[PDB]
Design an enzyme around this catalytic site. Sequence first.
Site, PDB file in Angstrom:
ATOM      1  N   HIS A  57       0.764  -1.236   0.000  1.00 13.34           N
ATOM      2  CA  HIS A  57       0.000   0.000   0.000  1.00 13.34           C
ATOM      3  C   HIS A  57       0.807   1.306   0.000  1.00 13.34           C
ATOM      4  O   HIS A  57       0.852   1.988  -1.016  1.00 13.34           O
ATOM      5  CB  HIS A  57      -1.008  -0.037   1.152  1.00 13.34           C
TER       6      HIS A  57
ATOM      7  N   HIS B 289       1.325   5.008  -2.912  1.00 16.47           N
ATOM      8  CA  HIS B 289       1.506   6.391  -2.456  1.00 16.47           C
ATOM      9  C   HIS B 289       2.900   6.954  -2.715  1.00 16.47           C
ATOM     10  O   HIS B 289       3.032   7.969  -3.395  1.00 16.47           O
ATOM     11  CB  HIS B 289       1.218   6.497  -0.955  1.00 16.47           C
TER      12      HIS B 289
ATOM     13  N   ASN C 255      -6.331  -0.762  -0.910  1.00 10.50           N
ATOM     14  CA  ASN C 255      -6.867   0.108   0.145  1.00 10.50           C
ATOM     15  C   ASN C 255      -8.329  -0.133   0.577  1.00 10.50           C
ATOM     16  O   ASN C 255      -8.625  -0.085   1.768  1.00 10.50           O
ATOM     17  CB  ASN C 255      -6.655   1.605  -0.245  1.00 10.50           C
TER      18      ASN C 255
ATOM     19  N   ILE D  20      -6.839   8.565  -0.974  1.00 13.54           N
ATOM     20  CA  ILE D  20      -7.053   8.254   0.440  1.00 13.54           C
ATOM     21  C   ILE D  20      -6.143   7.105   0.924  1.00 13.54           C
ATOM     22  O   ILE D  20      -6.192   6.784   2.134  1.00 13.54           O
ATOM     23  CB  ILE D  20      -8.556   7.914   0.682  1.00 13.54           C
TER      24      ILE D  20
ATOM     25  N   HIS E  91      -4.144   0.485  -6.158  1.00 14.98           N
ATOM     26  CA  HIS E  91      -4.418   1.134  -4.874  1.00 14.98           C
ATOM     27  C   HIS E  91      -5.811   0.761  -4.384  1.00 14.98           C
ATOM     28  O   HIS E  91      -6.009   0.525  -3.196  1.00 14.98           O
ATOM     29  CB  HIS E  91      -4.278   2.658  -4.976  1.00 14.98           C
TER      30      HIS E  91
END
Length: 849
Positions: A510, A515, A705, A849, A701
Amino acid sequence: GHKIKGTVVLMRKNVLDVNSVTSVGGIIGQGLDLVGSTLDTLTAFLGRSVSLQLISATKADANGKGKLGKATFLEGIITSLPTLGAGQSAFKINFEWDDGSGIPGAFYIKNFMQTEFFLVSLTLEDIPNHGSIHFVCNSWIYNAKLFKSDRIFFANQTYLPSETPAPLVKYREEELHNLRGDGTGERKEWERIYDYDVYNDLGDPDKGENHARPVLGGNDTFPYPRRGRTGRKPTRKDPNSESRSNDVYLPRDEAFGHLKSSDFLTYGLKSVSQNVLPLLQSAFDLNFTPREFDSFDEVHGLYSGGIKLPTDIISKISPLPVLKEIFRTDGEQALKFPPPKVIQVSKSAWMTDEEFAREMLAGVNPNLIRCLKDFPPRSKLDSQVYGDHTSQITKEHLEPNLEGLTVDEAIQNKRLFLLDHHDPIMPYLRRINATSTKAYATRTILFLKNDGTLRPLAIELSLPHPQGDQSGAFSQVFLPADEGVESSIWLLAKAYVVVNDSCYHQLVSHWLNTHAVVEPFIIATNRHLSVVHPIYKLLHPHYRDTMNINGLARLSLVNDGGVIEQTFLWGRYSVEMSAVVYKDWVFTDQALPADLIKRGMAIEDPSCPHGIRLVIEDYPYTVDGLEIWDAIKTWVHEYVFLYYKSDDTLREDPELQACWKELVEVGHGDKKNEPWWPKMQTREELVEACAIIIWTASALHAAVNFGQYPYGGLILNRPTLSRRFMPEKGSAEYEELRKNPQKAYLKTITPKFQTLIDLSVIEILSRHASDEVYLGERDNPNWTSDTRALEAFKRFGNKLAQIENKLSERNNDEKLRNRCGPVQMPYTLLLPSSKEGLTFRGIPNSISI
Ligand SMILES: COc1cc(OO)ccc1O
Ligand SMILES: [Fe+3]
């Protein structure tokens, strides 16, 4: 000559700002759709408040820069308009333009109001046989005296790096130069300067030595992607660290506002770690709630009656903005949590072996499993004997009530798989086990059964340096059992593997592979590809709010005393350990097909639908993602070959070349000499590179997520911390497993306090904001005047709409039960569209997010 008709659309700060929009959150988009006129405060923009100036794309002055035609001010409000919409205000403004002034192609804007506004668009109703020109802006316009250069916007038209219109060429390279803005000075809120810097702002050296953290990137020990540069003064006790600030800068426009209060998710998250965390620990340092769970039933009570705390705290963590939506309650002293989809049907299914294995394919982390080629599995660690040696997995104990195949045949038929968590934690284990955490480095062999289901055969719990460090790997191999202490032991054994997985997933699958990895591209794109560039427009939607969500993570998620260090196994070595894993990260292996092949989960087979034959067909993540990946590939290929005539037109592209060079040499500069980097020379290399970026920002993602709370909202199913070692066969611990295995399980996993922080945080992370822009061909309006591109885009959304239904019928196919499992939880994580909230589905365009 004439007088061109222009209509300006903007939004006032009040509409998008959290501090003033904390009033509306029950419903948005409606409310007479703020036509602007009613409750006129808009007269404020009239008069000498805002001025626009057209720049000719066809007529060049003395040198070669387009001719600018008279600063005109806003004259009057446009009350309604067919396509007005919520929060927007339209204004009329006619410009003095002659027949011999050419065609406008850009404009300048000055804001004399002392209060920024969000400029949305500008439309011009031309003069000659030329049609309406549209300017899509979506940018915050700050006061005119703060800039020195004056904000500039370009029309709809997408032009290759030729910078096409000659009168427009110097305007294109100038703004780009404004975007880089050099590398000195401290960045202010209103600035739009993109630049890189290393991760040197995660610890707090001044507050102590206990608070300093290793500098990530710029070195060979801990390489890391670059992050957005903020210009804070260095730490006092350390010149190489950046001083902490309660406010982290990110280029304005990368920070997205919202219409609804309940959509400021980053605001909710900031408040949990700042208001909720501190207030929550006082109730544990007290005695209102015991510090630990005593039974599973007491855990299940979290989403029923909730947790009773002094009303003194409740009337503090209830009225506050954004959280007033997320947190559940009844009234006085009762913070509840929504039930995770994992127990909504059955509350016991999570403990089953089939669910434990199924989640390696359809869970929150379905990216690790690999086909086992040799036996026993070996480590990739150095000369410390166990890596040179191998795994101590019992070849004497493999395949109980199932297949009468040998370990040699099972591997030949490709029926054995591995979930290897041994190497990453091993080098830090002696250090991790010196704290209040007791962890193991694990390995678990799984077997593919005839019915298509996976089944864990053996788990190896390894420890470090049994009387050494060299020739070290104090291993223990546990086997499956369905009753007696042996089953309570096995249950604990799975909890050890999962504690490793949850932490690997949070920091790597993740944070890192999504990110962290994506941020340097965002900086690279903005610094070198003009807004007008076709590739820029292809990439932009997938960058939305990424720098903003990451800025928050550096401030309160992955920082010195943050939630991650406090809730996950790797503790204070959480982020640095992910830099050690970054070592093995290879861009090209991020593409779904390559990844699958790399892990031996798929073999190349041209006859198959996507050009690869899957070793395990009932593999949800893979089967579904291959459909979406291919959709992305086709879309990027159609889009690229629409602007690039030959491979030479690509090599001639100065903006694309400078972009990639800086990305490789700076953005991911610790890997500049890697042989696998695509050379931007062929068009197929650009298609591949762009496809990987989009896949990462959207579907990867999303698959990683969004199942966090639905699977991990039940801490028992996805524990994040291990506090005890495996009970000694004769000790009082072993007798406790016999007496109270539940309490024995509770003392091994994450404590009560950390469980409440985890549930709170992953509850926000797994939620969709109501104004989310999904992969489902969603964009905003008229992003380009290129009709061919618009059509290629519709085709994209169309194949996604078809893929959706396609995935929906798989979930109704009873032969594919790895899609549901005993937990009866249909794999919907890869469905493109979603409504809002804790929806176990939906693929946003970017990492938001
Ligand atoms: C530090 O990495 C993280 C990033 C997140 O963003 O969605 C969430 C949790 C994390 O631990
Ligand atoms: Fe995330």
